[PDB]
């Protein structure tokens, strides 16, 4: 078996990991900048030139501060949550649709659901090992919302797989050669935005990891490098949700630069809803995840069952 396939797969995956990490740092810069411009105030400035090395000022500070612990005797379980969190956030990117072959993921949606189903696991070990009642409450709340929209996300992506006829992510490209799926799936676009802001903890679904009702949900005892790895993992999840919105709804367009312009625009939309919306409640979010989104998921899955049967007779 030809060895340059292994060599180029390794080089492409490591280049993807490096570029994703630097894009995470510049996404933190972009979020602090335009999130300021959501209000009247300016973003970061005055560090380096025009605030550009501000995430490197964050990275030098967070990798130097004292690694404190929630208890003094045994704290190796405190270490294993940001390692697995950053590992999953850098490991989920392997199911990106690459047209030049990197990994031939014939089942990419199942891989995405697997990594999202570990997201609950890394936040559960984040909550328990931090030895605080605020940490356990935030971990239970995050596990609650992420398994509540895991079922909804599985049904929404399962409705999307009926359109392309297979689980191969590159099959989203061939069915978008004439128009985007934003035209046909606009309530699904709004529902998928509500899904992608729920698995990754953002401001519309922030009762898990907010600064109001809790001081911090599961980052309350995490600092000095562990918080840096957790922050980078969460912003890599934001970047992955922006890419996965841009593949399914917007045309995959992997080569074109307009695809990455749209990916930066969907990241801008993620920071745009970061500054606008208030936060839902536990009871209203159980109402949203299990009744409204579930009923819409099953109903419009029935709609595509009927539509894919109707086109199968006509074709």
């Amino acid at each position: 078996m030809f060895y340059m396939e292994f060599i180029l797969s390794l080089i492409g995956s490591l280049l993807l990991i490096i570029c994703v990490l630097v894009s995470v740092a510049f996404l933190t810069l972009l979020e602090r900048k335009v999130l300021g411009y959501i209000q009247i105030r300016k973003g970061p400035n005055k560090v380096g030139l025009m605030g550009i090395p501000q995430p490197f000022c964050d990275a030098i500070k967070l990798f130097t501060k004292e690694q404190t612990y929630p208890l003094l005797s045994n704290y190796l379980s405190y270490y294993i949550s940001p390692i697995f969190s950053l590992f999953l956030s850098l490991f989920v990117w392997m199911c990106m649709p690459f047209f030049v072959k990197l990994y031939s993921f014939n089942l990419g949606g199942l891989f995405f659901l697997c990594c999202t189903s570990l997201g609950v696991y890394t936040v559960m070990v984040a909550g328990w090992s931090s030895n605080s009642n605020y940490a356990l409450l935030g971990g239970l709340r995050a596990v609650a919302q992420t398994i509540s929209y895991e079922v909804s996300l599985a049904l929404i992506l399962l409705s999307f797989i009926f359109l392309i006829g297979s689980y191969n992510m590159i099959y989203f490209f061939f069915y978008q050669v004439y128009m985007w799926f934003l035209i046909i799936l606009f309530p699904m676009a709004l529902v998928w935005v509500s899904i992608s802001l729920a698995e990754t903890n953002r401001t519309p679904f922030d009762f898990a990891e907010g600064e109001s009702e809790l001081v911090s949900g599961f980052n309350v005892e995490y600092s000095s490098g562990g918080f840096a790895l957790i922050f980078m993992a969460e912003y890599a999840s934001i970047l992955f949700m922006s890419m996965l919105f841009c593949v399914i709804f917007l045309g995959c367009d992997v080569f074109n630069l307009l695809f990455y312009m749209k990916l930066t625009f969907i990241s801008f939309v993620f920071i745009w809803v970061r500054g606008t919306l208030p936060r839902f409640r536990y009871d209203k979010l159980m109402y949203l995840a299990w009744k409204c989104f579930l009923s819409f998921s099953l109903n419009y899955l029935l709609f595509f069952i009927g539509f894919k049967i109707l086109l199968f007779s006509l074709l």
Binding site: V34, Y37, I38, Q39, I40, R41, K42, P187, L190, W272, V273, G275, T276, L277
Partner: protein
């Protein structure tokens, strides 16, 4: 126009007093705003329109925000144009100081003047209320324009008579301009 649940009187205004509309046009309008996020779209548009607004960030310290000639800052001891210190040790400022920061000890000088031997203001105790400059019969004690006087050390904010006299020597132009532009109000 929805009807009133409670009849609104003349001198009052009622909020959430409208009846919920039951005609099918208003029900379809509220249904489409619920389903298609119309009010969230208006909130997103109002939020996005503030990116194009001018930022109000005033770029400290190259550009500093507006002040007033009445502004209360660092306390300072003024002097006469001839050069004699203005403070006649009359102790109304310490009597009127509500946090009792001012400590005055006075002796007769060699020529027979009343001027102080000790005038200490605890700026960690001073509340910057400006009662001393109103209670000063001469214009001796004054609120200077300075507020960038943050100190590294707790003892450096214990202002002596020499520190107040040096503040009066340093800040005399702006203090005299504020007192010229503000004395007819007081």
């Amino acid at each position: 126009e929805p009807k009133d649940i409670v009849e609104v009187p003349k001198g009052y205004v009622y909020v959430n007093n409208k009846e919920l509309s039951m005609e099918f046009a208003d029900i379809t309008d509220r249904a489409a705003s619920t389903m298609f996020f119309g009010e969230l779209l208006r909130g997103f548009a109002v939020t996005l329109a503030h990116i194009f607004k001018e930022p109000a960030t005033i770029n400290y310290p190259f550009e500093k925000g507006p002040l007033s000639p009445r502004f209360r800052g660092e306390h300072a001891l003024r002097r006469y144009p001839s050069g004699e210190e203005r403070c006649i040790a009359c102790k109304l400022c310490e009597a009127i100081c509500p946090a009792q920061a001012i400590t005055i000890e006075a002796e007769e000088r060699a020529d027979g003047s009343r001027r102080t031997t000790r005038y200490d203001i605890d700026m960690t105790k001073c509340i910057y209320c400006g009662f001393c400059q109103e209670a000063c019969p001469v214009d001796a004690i004054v609120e200077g324009p300075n507020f960038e006087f943050s100190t590294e050390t707790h003892e450096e904010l214990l202002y002596n008579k020499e520190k107040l006299l040096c503040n009066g020597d340093k800040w005399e132009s702006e203090i005299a301009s504020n007192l010229q532009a503000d004395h007819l109000y007081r």
